[PDB]
Amino acid sequence: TYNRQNWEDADFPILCQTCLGENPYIRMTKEKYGKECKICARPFTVFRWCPGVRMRFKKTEVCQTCSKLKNVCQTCLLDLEYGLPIQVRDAGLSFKDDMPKSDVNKEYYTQNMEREISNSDGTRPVGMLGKATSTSDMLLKLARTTPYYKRNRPHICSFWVKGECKRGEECPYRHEKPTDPDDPLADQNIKDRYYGINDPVA
């Protein structure tokens, strides 16, 4: 009756090269408990920064414990070894891990694995690292190596979508016209991309 998951209060966000950017000279901001996790809802450490010039001022989404679970980016939510979705990596290597969908069981199991990682070393993408070494079978035919900046490209100016961005080029949001809303690739549920279930990009 006195059970809760502890808070992700740590440095060192584990990020992609793509969201990491191109500048070696990086200025950084860190919020301690500014937001919560997008999956397990623990109050996590927010890392916000500017990788380049034409930027979204990108920041981390989920907690470091969830990123330690799934080996995905804290912003991009794609797997750090290949740049691929975790649905693609789980279909390629092992899809027997999964996650409970109910909130109470999810938080209890999250507290269990959080205790497990806290008793463990700290830098390990949990149990399937021993079975994830057999890679480059087919997934490296299309796995990215380039730092993709067109997904780090900032959000669309909805005011100029309505045609009414009076700022023009002073507006830091994108003054290009948006993608297709009828396109299923534009849907992109964040929990689906975490869970590896029916992600349209995957």
Binding site: R27, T29, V53, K166, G168, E169, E170
Partner: protein, 142 residues
Amino acid sequence: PKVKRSRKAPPDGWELIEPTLDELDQKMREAETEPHEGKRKVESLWPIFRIHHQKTRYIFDLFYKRKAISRELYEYCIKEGYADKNLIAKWKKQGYENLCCLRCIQTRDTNFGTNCICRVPKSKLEVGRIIECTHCGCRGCS
């Protein structure tokens, strides 16, 4: 107009510099009574900054670049709140001449301990884009 805190006789050259301060006080009144909706939240603050910067620039030119006003009457306008003495003193610095606001140079206002980007020299921009400040709406006031 402005309620006089001194409640005394103003000096001699006040009587011809007062309509400029009267219309600038009406500019303060319209910057108070403008609607915030439509432009942005922080955008409506910037005419107050820029027009008060023009007020302080006008009195700064009365006392320094023309010396057309006296010292005691210049201090009377300071004590009546027309002129920002600190903004005048920062304009008297070598590298700070077109300084739009004292909020623009505060290192505690920035998260990185910096100044505003309209304080940056125009040769040191390296980013492009129509530069307009968040504090005051200034466009390259270095």
